[PDB]
Write a protein that holds these residues in place. Sequence first.
Motif, PDB file in Angstrom:
ATOM      1  N   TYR A  76      28.540   3.020  18.296  1.00 34.10           N
ATOM      2  CA  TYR A  76      29.583   2.106  18.735  1.00 34.10           C
ATOM      3  C   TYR A  76      29.241   0.998  17.505  1.00 34.10           C
ATOM      4  CZ  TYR A  76      29.525   4.796  22.939  1.00 34.10           C
ATOM      5  OH  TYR A  76      29.660   5.968  23.726  1.00 34.10           O
ATOM      6  N   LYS A  77      30.180   0.830  16.895  1.00 40.24           N
ATOM      7  CA  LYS A  77      30.342  -0.014  15.726  1.00 40.24           C
ATOM      8  C   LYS A  77      31.105  -1.279  16.141  1.00 40.24           C
ATOM      9  CE  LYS A  77      29.794   3.380  12.106  1.00 40.24           C
ATOM     10  NZ  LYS A  77      30.445   3.920  10.783  1.00 40.24           N
ATOM     11  N   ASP A  78      30.811  -2.442  15.498  1.00 38.58           N
ATOM     12  CA  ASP A  78      31.683  -3.623  15.809  1.00 38.58           C
ATOM     13  C   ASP A  78      32.879  -3.772  14.732  1.00 38.58           C
ATOM     14  OD1 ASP A  78      30.442  -4.403  13.559  1.00 38.58           O
ATOM     15  OD2 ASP A  78      29.464  -6.381  14.615  1.00 38.58           O
ATOM     16  N   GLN A  79      33.403  -4.761  14.653  1.00 38.50           N
ATOM     17  CA  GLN A  79      34.723  -4.984  13.695  1.00 38.50           C
ATOM     18  C   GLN A  79      34.196  -4.977  12.399  1.00 38.50           C
ATOM     19  OE1 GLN A  79      36.883  -8.405  15.079  1.00 38.50           O
ATOM     20  NE2 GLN A  79      38.135  -8.174  13.201  1.00 38.50           N
ATOM     21  N   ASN A  80      32.992  -5.247  12.005  1.00 37.72           N
ATOM     22  CA  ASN A  80      32.305  -5.446  10.522  1.00 37.72           C
ATOM     23  C   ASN A  80      31.820  -4.013  10.349  1.00 37.72           C
ATOM     24  OD1 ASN A  80      32.119  -8.491  10.716  1.00 37.72           O
ATOM     25  ND2 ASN A  80      30.884  -7.858  12.328  1.00 37.72           N
ATOM     26  N   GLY A  81      31.821  -2.968  11.047  1.00 33.19           N
ATOM     27  CA  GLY A  81      31.382  -1.745  10.723  1.00 33.19           C
ATOM     28  C   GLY A  81      30.030  -1.380  11.026  1.00 33.19           C
ATOM     29  N   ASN A  82      29.505  -2.303  11.585  1.00 37.10           N
ATOM     30  CA  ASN A  82      27.923  -2.350  11.909  1.00 37.10           C
ATOM     31  C   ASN A  82      27.531  -1.509  13.382  1.00 37.10           C
ATOM     32  OD1 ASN A  82      27.075  -3.772   9.557  1.00 37.10           O
ATOM     33  ND2 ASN A  82      27.451  -5.530  10.636  1.00 37.10           N
ATOM     34  N   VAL A  83      26.608  -0.698  13.466  1.00 41.35           N
ATOM     35  CA  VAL A  83      26.327   0.124  14.750  1.00 41.35           C
ATOM     36  C   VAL A  83      25.812  -1.014  15.614  1.00 41.35           C
ATOM     37  CG1 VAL A  83      25.103   1.650  15.889  1.00 41.35           C
ATOM     38  CG2 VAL A  83      26.119   2.257  13.550  1.00 41.35           C
ATOM     39  N   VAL A  84      26.396  -1.482  16.572  1.00 42.21           N
ATOM     40  CA  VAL A  84      25.748  -2.298  17.623  1.00 42.21           C
ATOM     41  C   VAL A  84      25.409  -1.601  18.941  1.00 42.21           C
ATOM     42  CG1 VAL A  84      26.225  -4.388  19.015  1.00 42.21           C
ATOM     43  CG2 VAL A  84      27.310  -4.282  16.754  1.00 42.21           C
ATOM     44  N   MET A  85      25.777  -0.662  19.275  1.00 41.13           N
ATOM     45  CA  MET A  85      25.483   0.312  20.412  1.00 41.13           C
ATOM     46  C   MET A  85      25.389   1.860  20.251  1.00 41.13           C
ATOM     47  SD  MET A  85      27.613  -1.865  23.375  1.00 41.13           S
ATOM     48  CE  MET A  85      29.211  -0.756  22.985  1.00 41.13           C
ATOM     49  N   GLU A  86      24.293   2.365  21.050  1.00 45.71           N
ATOM     50  CA  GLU A  86      24.216   3.875  20.816  1.00 45.71           C
ATOM     51  C   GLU A  86      24.140   4.385  22.408  1.00 45.71           C
ATOM     52  OE1 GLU A  86      21.358   5.447  18.187  1.00 45.71           O
ATOM     53  OE2 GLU A  86      21.766   4.070  16.621  1.00 45.71           O
ATOM     54  N   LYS A  87      24.741   5.703  22.548  1.00 47.87           N
ATOM     55  CA  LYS A  87      24.438   6.265  23.637  1.00 47.87           C
ATOM     56  C   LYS A  87      24.041   7.683  23.571  1.00 47.87           C
ATOM     57  CE  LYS A  87      28.016   7.435  26.198  1.00 47.87           C
ATOM     58  NZ  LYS A  87      29.290   7.376  26.825  1.00 47.87           N
TER      59      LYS A  87
END
Length: 302
Positions: free
Chosen positions: A251-262
Amino acid sequence: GPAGQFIRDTAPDGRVYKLYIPSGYNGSTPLPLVVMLHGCTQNPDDFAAGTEMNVYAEQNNFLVAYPEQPSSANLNKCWNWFDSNHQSRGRGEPASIAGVVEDVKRNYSVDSRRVYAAGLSAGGAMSVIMGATYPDVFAAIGVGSGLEYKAATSMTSAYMAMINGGPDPVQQGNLAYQAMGSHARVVPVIVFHGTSDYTVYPVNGHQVISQWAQTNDRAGDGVDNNHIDDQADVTMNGSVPNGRTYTRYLYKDQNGNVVMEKIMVNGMGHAWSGGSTAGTYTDPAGPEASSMMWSFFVNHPK
């Protein structure tokens, strides 16, 4: 040369905890600290033995603290994740767990930007609570077979949430943001859950991500920046040789960085993924949650 040590101590409030000091600790460099929160019926030694987290701590040079929940506080030795007295900053078990961190920081050189909380089951639900109540302390959290923030507020509702999930994750994510109060920041989250979990149904793992998408969307700086949703940007396939398959969602944020994983482990029950039969409630056929959670933590300092 130096040798790693798994010691015990008590914090000022009497909370028992065990601490793994890796052989590479020398006091000259602040080390990351992973707080591991055991599940019901477990204890620090059993959780360390099953998760093998001290092995990764030794290899990667980090400290591991394992707070103990005694049966005096909950007859099943579960963190009281379903009790409002244990869902807020400054009171109950959240304050006690934060106090373990403060006690380790007083006695060891700790990197304050690299303190993490992870746990299994009741400890996964409590890790969620730690992220919502002490986001100033915990850079990121890991949630093994847990439940969303305030998934229940009574023991009766706890059992219902374990099978059906908690309330609307959007509502719960706004409540978790409120719980952050004056300390709010984005808290990256990595979730593991088994698709054949008959104790905490996997709907709860899905909700943890949806709840944190909402909380992290509220907490991100800027009115038109740093937004994040619960729509997976990347879906990746995993396979353990001679073990289980799994799906890993990013799950990426608006900047394209991964912030969550499942990570949904196919056919896994209520257990820490991977690990050793030396501890209870593990599934060595699943992927190594301890290793993957550490990798996620490394990549998400404050």
